[PDB]
Amino acid sequence: LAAWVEKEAYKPGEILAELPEPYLFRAEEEGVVELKELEEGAFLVLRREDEPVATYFLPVGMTPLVVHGEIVEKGQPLAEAKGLLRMPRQVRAAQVEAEEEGETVYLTLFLEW
């Protein structure tokens, strides 16, 4: 839902988007990695190639994997996006600009922690 969901006029680590149910459909390629806990989620990495594959921001609204992740591969980011999707109270927020592919938008933020 591209039309005004997250607010730029917000405090560092608060609330984001409106009822994003149920986003899961497609995210390319995955592997297995050891547990690396955080504040709200984990530090999932596809440690598979030297040059980065995916920068894993595990949002407040996701289920981090333990040893699983080798049965579908093509588009398996287990657990949907439902409700609020909050933000840990330390990481900052900076800038947004939209893309063209179908129905969704790409976002970037600077994680100062």
Radius of gyration, in angstroms, nearest whole number: 15 Å
Number of strands: 0
Would you tell me the structural class of the helices and strands?
little secondary structure
Strand content: under 5%
What is the rounded distance between the termini?
29 Å
Largest sheet: number of strands, sense, barrel closure: none
Question: How does the overall form come out from the CA principal axes?
Answer: globular
Family: Belongs to the RNA polymerase beta' chain family.
Subunit structure: The RNAP catalytic core consists of 2 alpha, 1 beta, 1 beta' and 1 omega subunit. When a sigma factor is associated with the core the holoenzyme is formed, which can initiate transcription.
Function: DNA-dependent RNA polymerase catalyzes the transcription of DNA into RNA using the four ribonucleoside triphosphates as substrates.
Protein name: DNA-directed RNA polymerase subunit beta'
Question: Your description of this structure?
Answer:
The chain contains no helices and no strands. With 113 residues, it is low in regular secondary structure. The radius of gyration is 15 Å and the shape is globular. It is classed as transferase. Keywords: Symmetry Downshifting, Validation of Symmetry, transferase.
Secondary structure elements and pairings:
Elements: no helix or strand
PDB class: transferase
Keywords: Symmetry Downshifting, Validation of Symmetry, transferase
Entry title: Re-refinement of Thermus thermopiles DNA-directed RNA polymerase structure
